[PDB]
Design a protein around this ligand. Structure first.
Ligand SMILES: CSc1nc2ncnc(N)c2[nH]1
Length: 154
């Protein structure tokens, strides 16, 4: 009972693109781009598709940087999230129905208005380390348990 999702971070040398989620799950937080993988597409295709849909951007290349499993108390399906990052964007980001994009300098990442797991694994992403994580949440605000480690192969 796991379900595949994607998370894409646009990471340039001095800044990162995040999206203010307007509707639904994680609304009011600055999020990476992504969502559910569909039937008939690879995990990487799903990542490119969601990034395009949410921000208008396409990219030259995506790099797999991590995998995180989320469990929510009361929810039968685990979320199995494949995390990608990219520097090679094509186009300029624009607002979608779902998300309002905005750049943040790496020393002004708005951690207090992000999912609380981001405080744990973002540093690993910023150091170009590959990682495996697990987070158990109670609702959207409380982490009950977690594990996190560096890997060679994502
Ligand atoms: C579902 S738990 C979760 N953590 C996240 N961090 C950053 N961006 C997201 N969309 C995230 N979702």
């Amino acid at each position: 009972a796991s379900r595949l999702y994607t998370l894409v971070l646009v990471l340039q040398p001095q800044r990162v693109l995040l999206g203010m989620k307007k509707r639904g799950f994680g609304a009011g937080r600055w999020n990476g781009f992504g969502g559910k993988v569909q039937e008939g597409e690879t995990i990487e295709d799903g990542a490119r598709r969601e990034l395009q849909e949410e921000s208008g951007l396409t990219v030259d290349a995506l790099h797999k940087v991590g995998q995180i499993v989320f469990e929510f108390v009361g929810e039968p399906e685990l979320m199995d999230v494949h995390v990608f990052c990219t520097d090679s964007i094509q186009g300029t980001p624009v607002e979608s129905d779902e998300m309002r994009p905005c750049w943040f300098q790496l020393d002004q990442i708005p951690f207090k208005d992000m999912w609380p797991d981001d405080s744990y694994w973002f540093p690993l992403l910023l150091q170009k380390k590959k990682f495996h994580g697990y987070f158990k949440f109670q609702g959207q605000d409380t982490i009950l348990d977690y594990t996190l480690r560096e890997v060679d192969t994502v």
